[PDB]
Design a protein around this ligand. Structure first.
Ligand code: SF4
Ligand code: SF4
Ligand code: FES
Ligand code: K
Ligand code: ZN
Lengths: 592, 124, 115, 89, 86
């Protein structure tokens, strides 16, 4: 049944008339064949002859439905809506799919405004960075996940050989629901700039090329020189770090008699306020799908506009189909949906729990509380994580056998995966110790972490940035599009990236680098291949070998985790600059 | 200078000497596309060691030739029609809107059409 | 028409005991014609080495259990024998057959890009 | 409190059990009722509890230099589970 | 069912020992393709910029009408495979 104006994610329209039996709006043969031919000719009456120069050529719905349901025989000026969408309105078939998304879902200049390229069935709106570069029959399609945000949105990566051409959303009705952010799709050009392709050895104020045999030998002569004692070996994990490399680095430092392992975050409290002891203390226990059935949601120190754009659109969708009321505590911001602001600190949050907000949350069938990723980096994390936890434990509806009402929302993908493998030191005795050997496993948030002038610093990563500048020896790594990696999102779901292309230059898989360095440092890990590496993962957490599966925490155990917990600034200053891949993007510079 | 030979620019900053074999084209000095390999770097290979560079194929750059054509001007109309000036041997016929105050090139030929009432502004 | 020299009619053997005898008879034929293989194909090795190579290939399939796999293996072993004796294989193919043959460590493979 | 003051050589403990069934209940009851006492005696020791459907209960003890010894606790009594933890040292 | 048909197929041993196949439903048929090589999947030709390869399974995509057929065939060839759940 052909259509141009039907899409179940949007409102119903009858301005295309291709579904005649309009069956889209109507609830529940030669005339119909003739009708489809007659309607098809009308669209092609004014359509420009642009198929050779038009980016929708091999993937055009107007072409395919002209062939399938039509006969074989038979001037509007362009506009500018940003440097991301190329507009050729001559080809528009006047189907109003752009209007429904831009006003109902987007709420708009937006973090989701680039999704209109997918909905436009014709070449009226097309990706501008992708313009003129490839045809859909040239592209190899690879199903992987996003690591630009903690959501783990399922994306489709189209590669033409070595190059990565474009990123498209792929269906998943549990995390992203057919949408991705503009960061998720227009940062792929950073994978072709500032790439780490050769081992670089620092000799003074310069870097020179090096072999893997030397770059793993200079570290050995650097590790045996500074001679870090027990807890002087500091290992740091960044935002875009896979799980197979976090565990390999965790075991490498342990075999050197060290436990000083951490992330690139700046949480003042060394044991994170949520704590990594229990899974339920730091995951979206309610799961993203059950945000639909929400009654009252409490946003605590979070900005879903920037922390997780795709999930933010889920909140607006429920806000329109029902009478959902969402109460937000913290710094004010422009929102795509109505929010009742309460305050910009924790006094209001406690006072809100003693006000009308708490009464609704008590009698709500399915209450929700969302704590931001930047809350742990703020001073009153202990205040919030005890105020909310006491509220969670004191009431019954928040923790029920059928519903769990506590959810922590992160922004960086490597966080939850690191927590599950216990990659966060739980002591200030270990943390405050001076470091002599520093291993930057893809960490570039070091503007706040101490780096001693005499400490031996090694940067392993897939891009050249500030973190690579501080290094003494640089080891090139592979980006997520190039490695069969494992990432755990904020809800505790294990998802594995699938390798689409090889790493550039002489770069290696991120965990194979650490294992090889172990043999040079006498701490030879027992790992020999990925299957043996993933068997070790089950020895750190049994659920990690269960792809696309959320392991819900038992109700009884999660209660103790909630109990033991007893200015909210937005963590993101610039949306277009979050990870290293976005910084090297030339397209994101145009957005700036 | 090696900068006008290995970088992509809208217009050349100096006069193209057609006897200079390091130019990207005999009429243009710098490459006209970002992914296009500079001609100077291409010829610095083992296979060019004992070859005569002058006899290698050097077609003139189309980017320099297409913009020497005068802007077409339409009288008493807001739409320009182009079909390659060859009919069945040109390109597919397209209609070009002239609402804006600028010269809009053809999607196939590159001929830049404009309205006669906008002539003075565009020439400025 | 007539079959070529050293041709056997294809038959599906349904008895493991009868299959075992047919395999042993064919193994003897390979050993007997080993000196012929050195002569026709002008090999640079003694016939004693050729017989050793034959035994290795028969020892590879020593512990194949399934009868249907035995018949296909036996049928393919007969075709190869008819190919060698009749000199249908070119000498380069037989020379390379004897050209066939310590694995590197993890780091050694890591340095060169591994496999 | 008691013998739950783990030695310095003990660096990490991980507990595996299941959300359902009957074999994980003794470990579920043990950890739910006794967790504050252990974290009080070992403020810096990381106590990790990870669950998965159908796995049998056990405890992993990450000793010095990355050495790990894993003790299977399939169906043990709560009193013996406390004894088993005392025997990790 | 349990026959080692890889013994009489003629294919090289790497399909059984090294390469890993994927079974997936991309939207009405089930396909089988092979995971790319870590190295040697592609490399730019220095002469004309062609995309070189030493992966002889790169263009092979089996098609099946049912999920049962894809799994049964992969087992019959002794292939190392993982099913990509839809
Ligand atoms: S939108 Fe479709 S029909 Fe129109 S020019 Fe592009 S490919 Fe051709
Ligand atoms: S611009 Fe595209 S999405 Fe909008 S009405 Fe026209 S065809 Fe539909
Ligand atoms: S799909 Fe029903 S009229 Fe457009
Ligand atoms: K489109
Ligand atoms: Zn034209």
């Amino acid at each position: 049944i052909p259509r141009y104006c039907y899409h179940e994610k949007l409102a119903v329209a009858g301005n295309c008339r291709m579904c005649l039996v309009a069956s889209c709006a109507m609830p529940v043969t030669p005339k119909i064949k003739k009708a489809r031919e007659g309607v098809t000719e009308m669209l092609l009456e004014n359509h420009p002859l642009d198929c050779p120069v038009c980016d929708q050529g091999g993937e055009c719905d107007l072409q395919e439905q002209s062939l399938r349901y039509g006969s074989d025989r038979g001037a509007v000026e362009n506009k500018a809506i940003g440097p991301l969408i190329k507009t050729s309105m001559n080809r528009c078939i006047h189907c109003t799919r752009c209007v429904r998304f831009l006003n109902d879902v987007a709420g708009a200049n937006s973090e989701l405004s680039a999704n209109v390229i997918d909905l436009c069935p014709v070449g009226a709106l097309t990706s501008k960075p992708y313009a003129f570069r490839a045809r859909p029959w040239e592209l190899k399609r690879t199903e992987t996940i996003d690591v630009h945000d903690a959501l783990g949105s399922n994306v489709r990566v189209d590669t033409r050989g070595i190059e990565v051409m474009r990123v498209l959303p792929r269906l998943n009705d549990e995390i992203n629901e057919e949408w991705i952010s503009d960061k998720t799709r227009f940062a792929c050009d950073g994978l072709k700039t500032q790439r780490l392709t050769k081992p670089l050895i620092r000799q003074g104020n310069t870097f020179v090329d090096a072999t893997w045999e030397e770059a793993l030998a200079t570290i050995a002569e650097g590790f045996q020189k500074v001679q870090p004692k027990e807890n002087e070996i500091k290992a740091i994990v960044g935002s875009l770090t896979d799980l197979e490399s976090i565990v390999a680095l965790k075991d490498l430092v342990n075999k050197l008699g060290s436990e000083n392992v951490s992330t690139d975050g700046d949480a003042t409290t060394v044991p994170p306020a949520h704590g990594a002891d229990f899974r339920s203390n730091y995951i979206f226990n309610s799961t993203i799908d059950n945000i639909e059935e929400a009654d009252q949601i409490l946003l605590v120190g979070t900005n879903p506009r920037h922390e997780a754009a795709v999930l933010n659109a889920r909140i607006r969708k429920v806000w329109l189909r029902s009478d959902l009321e969402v109460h937000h505590v913290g710094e004010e911001f422009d929102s795509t949906f109505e929010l009742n602001h309460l305050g910009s600190d924790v006094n209001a949050l406690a006072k809100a729990l003693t006000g009308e907000v708490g009464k609704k949350l008590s009698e709500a069938s399915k209450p929700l509380i969302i704590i931001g990723s930047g809350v742990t980096e703020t001073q009153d994390a202990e205040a919030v994580y005890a105020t909310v936890a006491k509220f969670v434990t004191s009431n019954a509806n928040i923790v029920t056998p059928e519903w769990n009402g506590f959810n922590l929302l992160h922004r960086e993908a490597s966080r939850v995966g690191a927590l599950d493998v216990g990659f966060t030191t739980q002591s200030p005795e270990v943390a405050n110790t001076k470091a002599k050997f520093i291993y930057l496993l893809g960490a570039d948030e070091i503007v706040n972490k101490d780096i001693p002038k005499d400490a031996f610093v090694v940067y392993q990563g897939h891009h050249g940035d500030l973190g690579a500048s501080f290094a003494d020896v640089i080891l090139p790594g592979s980006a997520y599009t190039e490695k069969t990696a494992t990432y755990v999102n904020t809800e505790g779901r294990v998802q594995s990236t699938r390798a689409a292309t090889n790493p550039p230059g002489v770069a290696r898989e991120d965990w194979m680098i650490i294992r090889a360095l172990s043999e040079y440092l006498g701490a030879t890990l027992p790992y020999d291949n990925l299957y043996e590496m993933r068997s070790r993962l089950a020895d750190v957490a049994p659920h990690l070998l269960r792809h696309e599966v959320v392991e819900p925490v038992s109700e009884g155990i999660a209660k103790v985790g909630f109990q033991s917990l007893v200015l909210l600034k937005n963590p993101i200053e610039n949306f277009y600059f979050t990870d290293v891949i976005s910084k090297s993007s030339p397209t994101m510079a145009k957005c700036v | 200078s090696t900068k006008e030979l290995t970088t992509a620019r809208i217009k050349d900053i100096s006069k193209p000497d057609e006897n200079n074999l390091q130019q990207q084209a005999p009429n243009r000095i710098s490459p006209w596309s970002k992914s296009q390999k500079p001609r100077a770097e291409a010829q610095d290979n083992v296979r060019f060691a004992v070859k005569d560079l002058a006899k290698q194929p050097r077609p003139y750059a189309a980017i320099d030739l297409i913009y020497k054509q005068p802007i077409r001007y339409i009288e008493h109309d807001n739409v320009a029609v182009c079909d390659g000036n060859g009919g069945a041997q040109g390109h597919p016929k397209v209609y070009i809107n002239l609402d804006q105050n600028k010269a809009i090139p053809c999607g196939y030929c590159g001929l830049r059409f404009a309205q006669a009432a906008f002539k003075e502004d565009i020439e400025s | 028409t007539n079959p070529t020299a050293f041709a056997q009619t294809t038959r599906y053997v349904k008895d493991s005991t009868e299959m075992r005898t047919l395999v042993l008879n064919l193994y003897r034929r390979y050993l007997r014609h080993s000196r012929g293989f050195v002569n026709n194909y002008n090999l640079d090795i003694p016939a004693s080495q050729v017989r050793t190579k034959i035994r290795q290939e028969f020892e590879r399939q020593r512990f194949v259990k399934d009868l249907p796999l035995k018949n296909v293996l036996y049928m393919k072993a007969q075709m190869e024998f008819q190919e060698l004796v009749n000199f249908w294989k070119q000498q380069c193919h037989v020379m390379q057959y004897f050209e066939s043959i310590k694995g590197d460590s993890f780091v050694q493979k890591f340095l060169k890009g591994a496999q | 409190s008691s013998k739950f003051v783990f030695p310095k050589v003990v660096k990490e403990l991980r507990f595996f059990l299941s959300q359902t069934g009957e074999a994980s209940v003794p470990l579920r009851s043990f950890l739910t009722k006794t967790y504050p006492a252990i974290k009080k005696a070992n403020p810096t020791l990381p106590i990790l509890i990870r669950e998965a459907y159908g796995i049998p209960p056990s405890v992993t003890a990450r000793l010095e230099k990355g050495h790990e010894v894993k003790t299977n606790l399939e169906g043990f009594s709560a009193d013996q589970i406390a004894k088993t933890l005392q025997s990790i040292a | 069912t349990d026959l080692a048909k890889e013994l009489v197929s003629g294919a090289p041993k790497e399909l059984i020992t090294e390469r890993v196949a994927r079974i997936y439903q991309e939207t009405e048929t089930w396909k089988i393709d092979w995971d790319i090589l870590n190295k040697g999947n592609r490399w730019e030709n220095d002469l004309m910029g062609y995309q070189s390869s030493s992966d002889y399974m790169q263009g092979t995509i089996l098609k099946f009408d049912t999920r049962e057929g894809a799994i049964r065939f992969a087992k019959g060839q002794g292939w190392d495979y993982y099913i990509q759940e839809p």
